[PDB]
Structures are given as structure tokens and as C-alpha cells.
Design a protein around this ligand. Sequence first.
Ligand SMILES: *[C@@H]1O[C@H](CO)[C@@H](O)[C@H](O)[C@H]1NC(C)=O
Lengths: 48, 123, 49, 191, 48, 180
Amino acid sequence: SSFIRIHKVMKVLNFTTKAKDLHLSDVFLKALNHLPLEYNSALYSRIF
Amino acid sequence: LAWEKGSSGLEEKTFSEWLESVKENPAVIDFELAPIVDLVRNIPCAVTKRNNLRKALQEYAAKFDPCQCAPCPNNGRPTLSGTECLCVCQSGTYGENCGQWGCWSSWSTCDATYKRSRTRECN
Amino acid sequence: VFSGDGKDFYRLSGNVLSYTFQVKINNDFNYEFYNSTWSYVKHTSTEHT
Amino acid sequence: AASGTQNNVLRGEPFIRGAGFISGLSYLELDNPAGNKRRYSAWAESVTNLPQVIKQKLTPLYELVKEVPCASVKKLYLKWALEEYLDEFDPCHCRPCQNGGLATVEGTHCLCHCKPYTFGAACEQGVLVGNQAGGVDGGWSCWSSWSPCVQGKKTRSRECNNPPPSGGGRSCVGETTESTQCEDEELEHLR
Amino acid sequence: NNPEFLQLAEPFWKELSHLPSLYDYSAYRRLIDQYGTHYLQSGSLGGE
Amino acid sequence: FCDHYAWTQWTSCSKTCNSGTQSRHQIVVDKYYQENFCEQICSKQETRECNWQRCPINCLLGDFGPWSDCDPCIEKQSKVRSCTAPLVAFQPCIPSKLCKIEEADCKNKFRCDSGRCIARKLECNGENDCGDNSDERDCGRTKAVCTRKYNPIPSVQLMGNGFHFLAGEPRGEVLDNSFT
Ligand SMILES: *[C@@H]1O[C@H](CO)[C@@H](O)[C@H](O)[C@H]1NC(C)=O
């Protein structure tokens, strides 16, 4: 009997996100405006 | 390469093509995190809904926690996705279901001073 | 949408929340082989004179 | 006198779900058990060029009723209708199938879906190739009469039935009883 | 994402509007047969 | 010659879900058995596990809580409880107060038709910065910001998605990776 297991991982190209002044997306900013003013954990969990 | 892995025997010819394909379209492997509440900055009422989102995140972490999920057979990290708990299989393990921090305690009574504490156990 | 493991370009919408370009494929195999062979031989010889 | 009997039957049923290339892998199974590497790569490229949206998570369909005439009333009635649809032809009504078969309901007829390498009327014949542990698993019974809304709770009380765990298989997984809050005509049709 | 004003299809919206106000299991049964019981929220599209 | 005494059928699994054990063995001690030394070279039993999966506890929700007062711009009420039933189900509400505090978000910047608020400098630059061609709608003249059309970074959208630490699948898109 014989058993051989192999694995590998490559550190392919990446990028660093800027710290401040990040530009949000359309769907996110649209959903972020439908949030109520008063606190509501139920509707706030939806965007989470 | 995945298909030929049945009789790979430490194959290397397709490794170059697989590396080229990975360079063409990679997948997120390693990453650092930061609270998403810091991303909402340029809306009409930023601070109010930002504090509301912080409170919602606190209550969500109180509601859903990784400790709520049952432990895994072999050192797996259980994760909560919806109403089901899946075990993340590490290198060398397989199967459908493959220490860790326990559940937090209830918030103690607010003392005369600001100091209010919460205790977690590594059981 | 940017070209990830596909065509030149793609167009998303407001109702669609995300598009992903992470190609992950799995596989499994279960091969078997066996053989059962039987061989029984019997002989007898009796001579009387 | 010499007599010899030879009998060998080998059948394969490949499933390659690449629209046009799907038939290639199915036809190649004739005398070739191992899949061709080039054909497998072609099928992978085809599956890349055509999605397979199956194997995704689901959500209650009745939730999409948001902006329509009498929206909330229609949503509540669709909730009730989906509950009645789910419990009217649930697989609990069908009798258990032999050899761990899974029963379904198509209209007013039960169908015992047989495991691979098996066949028969109720999945009884062709037990030559099981490749499983075996036994008889447990199956949930049909839900009894619903609660009369004494305090809002439910009285489903799903218990064991005529297919008990006999061959050592695992019992029916899930809750034994259920508990909810009676709608009270859904708050008297929303306040 | 689920919570939004998702643009419904013409036949889906038409059949939802043709549903009677009063509770009638007849139309809702055909609607559930034609449209199903659940809709997809998220997940990959891996083949089989 | 071990299969001459056929193996019996696999017995029932020892337990339902926790841990399973089953065994099988019809060996008669005849002349054929004793003269072929089948006792030493042939096994007499075969054991294997069954139902090696865990015992998942059934998803158990809790009773509904008290109704929450509603003051959003949309008359909806929340009801949260702690599976196949919905986690949180919202219904129409009776609002004591309707929407309020509605005003223009942009003060010194441009207001896109979709609601996005971008700087006025990004207007009339030959690039769709709002997303719906609102800034480039009727620009009489534009200033070339880039001399030649260049290709975008491949798989750049994967680094803009959100990450849900609890779910193990990061999230849908939150940040835009096409804006420049
Ligand atoms: C006997 O077993 C060998 C093992 O590989 C196999 O190749 C051969 O076809 C078998 N012969 C039979 C079953 O007649």
C-alpha cells in the first residue's frame, strides 16, 4: 500500500487598500440610505 | 491539473499552466481586517448612523458568536452561516464536517464607576 | 465588471450585489479492482486383478 | 462431459452537467472507464463558459411581496398557502421504501427513488452493489393537528412512525415538537 | 441581496397581482406550482 | 482460499449517530478446513465503522419579543427572535411619526442622480464617476485625464468585497473597484 498527499500555496500579486477617502459602491450607498434614523437592530442586521 | 491529480504522482508539467492561470485570476488567501463601520463617512448624517451601526454590531456579536456552534472533530474552526454551523477543514483533513474561545458572559451590573466588565473563557 | 477568468467585460446591475472571479473546483474518485479464482481437481484410480 | 458458463455485465451511466460537451463524456464511457484528460479540460472550459447556478442557498419566496396592491395581506396568505402546500404532500405520507430508498410525491403518486446500482418496484432488487454501510434509517411522521392557539404555541409533535430504526441506522434528525406564536389573524390584519 | 426594491419579473408581478384579496388556496396553489417555494440568496455556481 | 466460507451480512450499526461498529464472519471445521491450514492464513471476522457523522443538535429558535416602536421613513415594524423559519420578520407598522430630517447631503460637492456625492472637480472629465453618466451627461467640453485607454487590473473586485468574519464566506461587493 502507498499513500501520497501534496499541497501548495502561491503568493500571487496583491494590492493595498488606501486608508482614507475610500469610494463606496452604488448598491452599498443606495442600501445605506434606506436605513432608519432611529436605532433598529433588525433592519441594521440586514446590511450586515 | 485537478483532473490529472488522480494519477499525479507529484506532477510538474501542468504546474506552470496552473500558476499562469492563478496569476491571471487569483483568489484571496491572506488578508487583514478592519471594522466596516469606518467606511460610512460621506453620507448626510454620518456620526448618528455610525454610532447606530456600532451598537447594531455589538448586539449582533452578542447574538451570534462562533462559540454557539458545536465544536469540530479535529481542531476545526466552526463558522456560523445563517442557521447552520460548518467546520473549516485545515490542511490534511477532509469530510463534510472535517483550543477555541468559549462564549462570553452576561454584562455585569454597571458599577458606581465607569468600569463594567465581561468575561470570556478559553474552554 | 472587470475581466476575471472570462470574457472581455461584463455588466452588473443594481439588484445584483456582487460578481466573483475566484475559480475553485473540487474532485473525488473511488476506483476498485478485485479477482476471486477457484480451482478444484480430484482424481482416483483403482485396479484389481 | 465438460461445461463452462461465462457471464459478465458491465454498465456505466456518466453524468456530465458545457452544453454540447456534456454528451461527449457520457458517450466516452463505452469501454473507457477513465475520463480523457483533453476531454475533461474541454468540459471544464465549457463549464467555465456556461454557469451552473445550482447548489446555492435559498430564502423564503413569499418575502419578495413588497409593493403590490394589498401587499401584506397577500404575503400572509402566501405564508399560509406555502405552509399548506408543504404539509399537504410531504414525504411523510408515503410509505418507507426498501433498501434505504427515498420517497417523493408527484401529484398523488409516491415514487421510491432508488440508490445507484439498484432497481425494482420499491428499490428491492439489485442489492449486489451497495457500497454503503446499510440498515434502515428513521423517517419523520406527518404533523398532527395544529394547536388551537391556547396561548400562541404550536402542537405539531412530530414523533416516530411505522419506519422505526431497525437496521441500526440513525433516527430521524430534527426537533420532536415545535413552538411559535399564533398570529391572531396576523395582529387583526396589521393593527 | 434580498432586502431592496428588487425589480420583479412581468409574469411574476402579474400573477401576484391577479391573486384575490380574500384567502383563496386555488390561485396560490397554481402560483406555488409555477414559481416554486424559494428563491436564491447567495452561493457559488459549481457544476456537478 | 478464504472466501470458501462466505461472509455473513453486515450486522446493525452499534449506535445511531455518535459512533458505529459492525462486524461479519459460516466456517465449518471439516476435513477441507483442517487439511488446508485455513485457520492461520484466513481471517475470521471483518469490522468497520458505520455512520461516522456527528450528531448535529437541531436548530432551536426562541419565542418572539415585544413589538418595537417604528419611526423610519418607511412604515415598517421590527420583531426579532433568537432552521427554516425566518430569523426576523417585519410587518407594516402604525407610525406615530413619518419621515423627517430629509435634506441635501452634498454641500460643496456635486450630487449624482443615483444619490452618490462626488467632488465637483470630477465632473466633465471624460469618465463616468457617478455610475449613471450623470456627471458626463451634457458636458460641452472635457479635459483628457488619461492619454490612452488602459485595461483594468484583473480580479481587482475581489479585494473590494466585504468580509463577514462569522460566515466564512467574506461578503458581496461593498467598495467600488472601477472608480479611479
Ligand atoms: C484477475 O485479477 C487481475 C488483477 O488485476 C485482473 O487483471 C484480471 O483481469 C483478473 N482475471 C479474471 C477476473 O478472470
